[PDB]
Design a binder for these strands. Sequence first.
RNA 1: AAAUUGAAGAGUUUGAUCAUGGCUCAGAUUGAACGCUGGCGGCAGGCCUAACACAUGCAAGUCGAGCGGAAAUCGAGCGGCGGACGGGUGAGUAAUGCCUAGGAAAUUGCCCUGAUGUGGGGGAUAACCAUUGGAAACGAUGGCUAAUACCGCAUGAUGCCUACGGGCCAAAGAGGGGGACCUUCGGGCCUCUCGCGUCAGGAUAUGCCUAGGUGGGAUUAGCUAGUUGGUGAGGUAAGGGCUCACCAAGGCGACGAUCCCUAGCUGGUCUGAGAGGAUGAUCAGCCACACUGGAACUGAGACACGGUCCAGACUCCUACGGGAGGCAGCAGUGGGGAAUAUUGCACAAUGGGCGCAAGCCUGAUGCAGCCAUGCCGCGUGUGUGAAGAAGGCCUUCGGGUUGUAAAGCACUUUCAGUCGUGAGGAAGGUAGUGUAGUUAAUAGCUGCAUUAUUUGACGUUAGCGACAGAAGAAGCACCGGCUAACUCCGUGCCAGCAGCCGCGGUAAUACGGAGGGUGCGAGCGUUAAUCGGAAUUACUGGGCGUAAAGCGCAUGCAGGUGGUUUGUUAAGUCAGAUGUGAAAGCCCGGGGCUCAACCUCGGAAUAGCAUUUGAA
Lengths: 85, 205, 123, 79, 82
Amino acid sequence: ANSKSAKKRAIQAEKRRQHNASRRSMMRTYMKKTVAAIEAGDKEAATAAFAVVTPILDRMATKGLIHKNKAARHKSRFTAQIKAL
Amino acid sequence: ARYLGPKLKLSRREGTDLFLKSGVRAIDTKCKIDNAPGVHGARRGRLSEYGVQLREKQKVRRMYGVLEKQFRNYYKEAARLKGNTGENLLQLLEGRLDNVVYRMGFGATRAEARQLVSHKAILVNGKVVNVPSFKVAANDVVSIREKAKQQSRIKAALEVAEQREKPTWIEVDGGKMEGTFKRMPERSDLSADINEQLIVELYSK
Amino acid sequence: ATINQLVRKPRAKQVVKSNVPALEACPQKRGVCTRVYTTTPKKPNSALRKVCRVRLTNGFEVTSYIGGEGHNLQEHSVVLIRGGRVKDLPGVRYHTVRGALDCAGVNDRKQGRSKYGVKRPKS
Amino acid sequence: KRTQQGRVVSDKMDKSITVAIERFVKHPIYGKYVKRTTKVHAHDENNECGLGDTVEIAECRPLSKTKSWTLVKVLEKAK
Amino acid sequence: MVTIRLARHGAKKRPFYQIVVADSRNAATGRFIEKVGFFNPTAKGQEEGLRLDLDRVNHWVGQGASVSDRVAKLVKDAQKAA
RNA sequence: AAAUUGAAGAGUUUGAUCAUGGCUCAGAUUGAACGCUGGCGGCAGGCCUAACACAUGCAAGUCGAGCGGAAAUCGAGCGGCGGACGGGUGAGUAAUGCCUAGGAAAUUGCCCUGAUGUGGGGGAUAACCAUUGGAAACGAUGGCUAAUACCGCAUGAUGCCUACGGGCCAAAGAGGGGGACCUUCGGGCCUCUCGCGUCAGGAUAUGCCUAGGUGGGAUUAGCUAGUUGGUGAGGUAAGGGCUCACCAAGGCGACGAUCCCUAGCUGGUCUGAGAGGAUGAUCAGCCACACUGGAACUGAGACACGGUCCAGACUCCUACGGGAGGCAGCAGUGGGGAAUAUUGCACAAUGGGCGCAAGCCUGAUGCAGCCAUGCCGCGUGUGUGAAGAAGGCCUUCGGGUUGUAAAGCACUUUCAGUCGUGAGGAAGGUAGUGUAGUUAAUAGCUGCAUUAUUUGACGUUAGCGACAGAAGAAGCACCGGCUAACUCCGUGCCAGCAGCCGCGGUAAUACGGAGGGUGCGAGCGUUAAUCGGAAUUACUGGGCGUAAAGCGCAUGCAGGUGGUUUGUUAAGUCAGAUGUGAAAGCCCGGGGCUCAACCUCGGAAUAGCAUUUGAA
């Protein structure tokens, strides 16, 4: 990068990438836990996992890591998919 | 540019008087007017329609001392303007300041008129105009700056213009050395020797 | 032609052709003379007409006329060519611009000098 | 309610009518009025319509790659 | 954001400004939303120095349009004109 | 009121003719080039080629009122915001773009409006210090520390999910001032300012969809298999084969699919009586691209010109281990080319970024330089002047002509020159003071005035005066016909000319010179190129017995067209309304520059499309 500012932006963007990746990774891990249980079939364990993920999804939506709409989608789908069990 | 070269030569080609000298001596006494310029001057015959048109166009240009690019623009305006393209063209040429200071008599020729205009001798509505081709409108007052009110060429030219017929569309107090362009001339007011029709026709050809 | 015929297949625009294809729609073109020779006109006409084969910058080889009396063009002269058929000479579609690059003005021309590259006589 | 009428011209797709809409246009050059045809894949939920039927369709959201029209009403069924 | 600002037209040494509503991100002399007036800084004779449709100005300000300092001063001048 | 007033032909086929029919010419135009020539000004324009390669400088920063600090009110650092704009280019793209008109399934930083909050905690980390790797680039290791950096917890509904019934989610302080109450005298405490969260509207911006329109080729007729549709899942801001699995066999195409060639699109521009034709510089809108190819990251927004990563070609540095770079930003260089400019000045103005502001930054932009590249204006003198000078040229040797031309004699002095004067572009900034709001407040803050003071790159500015003197300022093409303008010499089918027809082989108005003339004029010619003329692709507006042209004849699908009549419908048609058809341009009226170009106000126009109401 030519300018000092460009060089900084690059550094910052890296730290943010690392941060976002960690958070995304986690939110995904907790989503996979719901998905696992809905696939296994366990209407209890599914709701349990879903209670862990709901805050995370809503938090990450406000903190920008995902959109509100994406949180809604996952929550809505997951709810149907458990109720379905 | 302005055509700077021998004047009567032009009149000889056009076969007429263009008034390029003050009319103190008759054009015939200063030149062989009935012969064209040059060694083939006493040999005139068939001109084409094109030549006939061309001559008429040149007659009018040379009278008013306008070059082609300007003259063609005048035609374009005369056309754009409402009504008679031929008449419009003449009233455009007649509305020029260098012509208007000639018609009033401040200049003995249209070329002296132009020098007067260029050299900042002339006011229009009390402002100094030194553009020959400025379009004097109706009820405009062309005057002479107090500086130039003492130029004897001007006094001269007033008495030269006494020798001509008066413009009935221009009023002049030559004592106060100011004139009013009362109104634009009609076709009837001007020379009927001019066939404007041919010039319109030339600029379709 | 009926309207319905014209609706089915409209009237065809006509492909025009350039007489000066080598210029490639440029006003002039530089080339190097490969041969400077003379050729005889098509008959009714009789002369020895000074021409040059020229390799242009766009890689065309063309024959250009060398107009006016006398010229200084050897093989390897760098000339500018313009458009212009010579009616007499079948093949010649270009003129060599006299008075431009290695081509010199026609010596001791005094009318139409600009066409032949000759400067104004110091009077 | 800017709908467009037309005629079913295929029905072989599941839940999809191809409908041929027909415009009568003055020719830009030659002045003659000319039949021109827009085909427009519409959506038919119930597989109601059949090849030949005259239907009224309406523009909607994209329902597939090529379907952004929907069957309003069948106007006249085929012989 | 939407801004009310001067857009230079006219000729070299003879600026003539259109007062325009525009997205700020545009070039001042490019894509504008609405022309709301003009400002001739060197107007003579009968030629108006400042036309400005204050109603339209207010409309846009009420929708969160900024005004440039210059247009802000011409708004005052158009109000001392009213 | 007006928004127009518009339409020319000629040459050449023959012994001659009339037709047919090419070819050619006169016009207008230009991002031109070239030749000759060249004074000034105004306003525009200026790599069309090599999306070739690029030396050098510069084109994106800013904030100390976020933070620890301190190298010298500020470097470096953290953090915020910007860097997605502005600027460039047209390579790709023939429709995933553009234009027009709709649509539904979206998001949208900054801004505005409204409503709500903003509690209580935590762990880090750069800078720094210590040590150490490296030639450098760039690192490493160990301590240290702050925040509007980051994280949890609390809290939140008019948010989101939920069939309920419920469940779930965030945030940040900083600065100015101060009455009283407090004060461990730090501050709490009040008020205002600038910030912080969430939600809802608005605005703006953008994504997505549809229809119609938007080159050439049929000596390119089949094309497609995530292909076309369905179901479900995933995925997205959002609908959707967007993706996958599965089911079905669809889909497109002679109203030209597919393929190939070419190409950024539009407003417009040029030409044209128009209908058309041609075109897409400058200006403005949209799109695409950024050494080539790929990729995402960060973010409201990028798959990012001056960011990241990877691969590649190239260039460079290297201490051989390893590094560095991307002018299609502005100047500029080389190269290519017929051909296209300064390594300028300034942020004064208009904007843009950041900032409470002051400001800082800004090759955007304003200006300046260069070039007759274009348009427009002006000048290069005016009048008088016959011996009709001389000289040149011609001559019937009489004369004619150059030519009132020159000289001479009176004048004038624009513009150049010199010296002076001298607008306008400037809005603001700062500091007082007062006021009027806020507020506990004669504080602070914000506005309004008012005083003082400061802000112009252009710039020795335009504009004006004053001088002195015609003084400093004219070419270029042409003169056989077309086509305005003719003679004499030289030449002798040579030399040469030429757009076409042709000209030249001894009295050449065609070659070359001269005299004279014609046209145009700071230009004039040539070449290239577009339209015109060309009714010569004919819709307007042509033809086919013999000039080019009726299929050898027929049958016939698609298509085209279709008798009479009633009713109905209203698709075509017609009329009107509404929305839209950007601005600029064009046109008509004005207005402003001494005029003009140019700038500018209003209108007309945008012949269309959508919706809608009528007529039949």
